Amino acid sequence: AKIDNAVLPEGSLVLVTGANGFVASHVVEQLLEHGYKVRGTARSASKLANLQKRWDAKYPGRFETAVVEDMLKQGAYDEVIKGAAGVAHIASVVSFSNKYDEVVTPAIGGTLNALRAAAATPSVKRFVLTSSTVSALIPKPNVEGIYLDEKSWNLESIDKAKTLPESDPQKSLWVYAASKTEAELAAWKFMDENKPHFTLNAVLPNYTIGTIFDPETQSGSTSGWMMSLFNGEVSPALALMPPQYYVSAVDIGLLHLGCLVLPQIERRRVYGTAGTFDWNTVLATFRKLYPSKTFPADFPDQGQDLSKFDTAPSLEILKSLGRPGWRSIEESIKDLVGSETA
Ligand SMILES: *O[C]1[C]([O])[C]([C]OP([O])(=O)O=P([O])([O])O[C][C]2O[C]([N+]3=[C]C(C([N])=O)=[C][C]=[C]3)[C]([O])[C]2[O])O[C]1N1[C]=NC2=C1N=[C]N=C2[N]
């Protein structure tokens, strides 16, 4: 098909964990769009019901719901991984609890449980892990000299995630960062120690903006929080998010696809970082898309993100898939909130 020399044959089955999630649903969408069959897991079939209906209508018989109530359970993937040529492990703890135990441990456990299943399944040749830019750093507004590459690790989050008092408003963020960081480190360590017969790549998105396919049963994650602002809600949690990088949900789906099928992408940490933004650029975009609508006034200046990311593999993947360059923030936000038109 489109993808020449794809490592996974046309129509191959890909297992996507936590398929009812926001980012995962976009990864599924892109896989289906490219002719691959997908078996997506969710803690309940009901959680995927609306998305199943969407995909059955758009991609008849290409998506299959698979129930995995406990992603940490021994043998959890024995049945659903059968025949899969690729695996995309996307599910992770996003409760933003300040409890290191309820976030970090399960994050690592879920990651290794999926990796072990893949290692035990000869048919699996490619594995893509959804990490995050927080596995490299927590944004530091107005700070110069920050360049993140594939060797950048958020080592400071591991210590802060358990040294910071619960009163620090960034506590849960550091715990989440430690969970992502330790989970990804564990994945690469597993690869180097066990040397399984599949290739691993990780996608590290920053703030993912895009269409929430199932508003009914999808909270939306990052995009859901942005939608709440669109609807006029200004939550303090929103203030716990500093200026950083955005990335289109469409592009994140494409990066996962590239990691699963492009031959030139192996053992890479692919940054999903299109450009910088802050809540005021978001509000500005809202006002541009809906000139007649009332929106909250600008937030106080929160500085700007002066960091830079090594996006070489990301750009290589996008170009190889025929969608070169990053989708703009205006188009990304429009994918989420639409525009004033008729
Ligand atoms: O169930 C659940 C779901 O499926 C998931 C989640 O989803 P949400 O919430 O939507 O979120 P998200 O975001 O999509 O997530 C996914 C992934 O990705 C990542 N990231 C993201 C981003 C943005 N968005 O922007 C960036 C970066 C990165 C994260 O981290 C993750 O990994 O999941 C699931 N879960 C939860 N919890 C749990 C689960 N499963 C199972 N178990 C448990 N515990």
Curated annotation (Swiss-Prot):
EC class of the enzyme, as a word: oxidoreductase
Name of this protein: Aldehyde reductase 2
- Give the consequence of mutating G21A: Results in loss of substrate inhibition and of NADPH-dependent reductase activity
Task: Locate the residues binding NADP(+).
Answer: Y176
Q: How does activity depend on temperature?
A: Optimum temperature is 40 degrees Celsius.
Q: What does this protein do?
A: Catalyzes the asymmetric reduction of o-substituted aliphatic and aromatic aldehydes and ketones to an S-enantiomer. Reduces ethyl 4-chloro-3-oxobutanoate to ethyl (S)-4-chloro-3-hydroxybutanoate.
Please list the reactions this protein catalyses. Answer: a primary alcohol + NADP(+) = an aldehyde + NADPH + H(+)
Q: How is its activity regulated?
A: Inhibited by quercetin and diphenylhydantoin.
The record's InterPro entries line, in alphabetical order, gives: Epimerase_deHydtase (IPR001509), NAD(P)-bd_dom_sf (IPR036291), NAD(P)_dehydrat-like (IPR050425)
Instruction: Provide the GO MF annotations for this entry.
Output: alcohol dehydrogenase (NADP+) activity
Its Enzyme Commission number(s) read 1.1.1.2
Q: How does activity depend on pH?
A: Optimum pH is 5.5.
- What protein family does this chain belong to? Belongs to the NAD(P)-dependent epimerase/dehydratase family. Dihydroflavonol-4-reductase subfamily.
